[PDB]
Design a binder for this molecule. Structure first.
Ligand SMILES: Cc1cc2nc3c(=O)[nH]c(=O)nc-3n(C[C@H](O)[C@H](O)[C@H](O)COP(=O)(O)OP(=O)(O)OC[C@H]3O[C@@H](n4cnc5c(N)ncnc54)[C@H](O)[C@@H]3O)c2cc1C
Length: 378
């Protein structure tokens, strides 16, 4: 009957809620955003249209609800390797070897909404429009303060036995913990910026691709260039979500004129005009929201009395593409629930061991992602 407040309803917070729901906790899930499932919610906070979910990501979901997981991952698209497109438009297929991990394309909106639908079926209370503003820590029940609704009111308070921060890279929960526990902490803002482009489905079925795909759906497509990159991952309807990645200065330098963007696109990626509308590409490029990307590390991840813990981007936000934040966050949840099961529900011991065993793995995954990016960008 122990109570837990889970701060943040992104991918990792929903998975965590589903996790704790099923173990028999009374879960309340909070997020300052409105419900993304609602027609009236205009900003769905989707950092990307699709994602590469790996074997670890998949397993973690499977270990929490195999029956729903089957239907949740129904329309994912398995990848067999990477397809490299050189400057001349030549394509080379590079299949996934004995060091590389296999991945699947899945739609972000569909995953996150489907998790919310499983939560709706569970005992979990969903509280949208609730912004965590403060935690009062005690040796029994932590006091959470929220503000509600626009000119944010005051959801008075509620008390919970413990708190899980899944509140993203800018975690309010994390700051509150820092006032209670000496936390080693770093934040590094990357030079990276990304822009989403669109490759439409073909008009006709393409028998050799098994759908209306302009290029091969079973490859992650990559156009590697000097300090920048284009990628494309298939969507269910035959389209591809394409993403351009480079330094902010390069991008800021390009978007000063539409013809400069266009010529840049034609000169690099010449095989893209056969499958993409250049004018729509130029407009997307110039107007796609500029988003800061921060990388963080924490130690420890927990407040000592088993009172709180940080999972997902709140704990270890990393470089996109070179790192896999969602997969790592899913793995976070799987690892924590096994530790709770192992210690018969003893939070104090479980959270403590999580920090002792997880930190070294995460320092490594996140440093490797930083290093792989650093090398590309220099
Ligand atoms: C372009 C791009 C591509 C990516 N591709 C992949 C990929 O292919 N594979 C992969 O594994 N990862 C990928 N990632 C990383 C992945 O998107 C993230 O790691 C993952 O979505 C983070 O999940 P989260 O639940 O921890 O955080 P978030 O998605 O940030 O969710 C946090 C939630 O907390 C809420 N919140 C914040 N503050 C408060 C507050 N004070 N009170 C209440 N709620 C609050 C926010 O509203 C938000 O909804 C990609 C990232 C980017 C940017």
């Amino acid at each position: 009957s122990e109570s837990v407040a889970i701060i943040g309803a992104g991918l990792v917070g929903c998975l965590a809620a589903l996790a704790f729901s099923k173990e028999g906790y009374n879960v309340t899930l909070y997020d300052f955003r409105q419900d993304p499932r609602l027609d009236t919610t205009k900003n769905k906070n989707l950092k990307s249209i699709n994602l590469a979910i790996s074997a670890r990501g998949i397993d973690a979901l499977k270990s929490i609800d195999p029956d729903a997981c089957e239907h949740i991952l129904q329309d994912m698209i398995p990848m067999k390797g990477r397809m490299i497109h050189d400057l001349k438009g030549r394509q080379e297929s590079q299949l996934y070897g004995l060091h590389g991990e296999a991945i699947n394309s899945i739609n972000r909106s569909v995953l996150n909404n489907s998790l919310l639908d499983e939560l709706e079926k569970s005992t979990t209370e969903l509280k949208f429009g609730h912004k965590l503003v403060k935690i009062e820590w005690t040796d029994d029940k932590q006091i959470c303060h929220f503000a509600i609704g626009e000119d944010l009111k005051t959801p008075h308070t509620e008390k919970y036995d413990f708190v899980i921060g899944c509140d993203g890279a800018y975690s309010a929960t994390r700051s509150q913990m820092q006032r209670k526990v000496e936390m080693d902490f770093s934040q590094e803002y990357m030079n990276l910026r990304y822009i989403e482009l669109y490759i439409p489905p073909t008009e006709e079925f393409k028998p050799n691709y098994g759908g209306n795909f302009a290029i091969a759906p079973d490859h992650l497509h990559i156009w590697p260039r000097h300090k920048f990159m284009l990628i494309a991952l298939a969507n269910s309807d035959g389209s591809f979500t394409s993403t351009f990645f480079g330094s902010k200065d390069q991008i800021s330098d390009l978007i000063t004129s539409k013809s400069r963007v266009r010529e840049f696109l034609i000169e690099n990626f010449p095989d893209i005009i056969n499958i993409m509308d250049l004018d729509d590409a130029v407009k997307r490029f110039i107007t796609y929201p500029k988003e800061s990307l921060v990388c963080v590390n924490c130690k420890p991840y927990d407040v000592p009395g088993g009172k709180a813990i940080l999972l997902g981007d709140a704990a270890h936000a990393m470089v996109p593409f070179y790192g896999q934040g969602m997969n790592c966050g899913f793995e976070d949840v799987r690892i924590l629930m096994a530790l709770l099961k192992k210690h018969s529900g003893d939070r104090s011991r479980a959270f403590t061991e999580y920090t002792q065993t997880r930190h070294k793995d995460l320092v490594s995954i996140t440093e490797l992602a930083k290093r792989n990016y650093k090398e590309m960008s220099h």
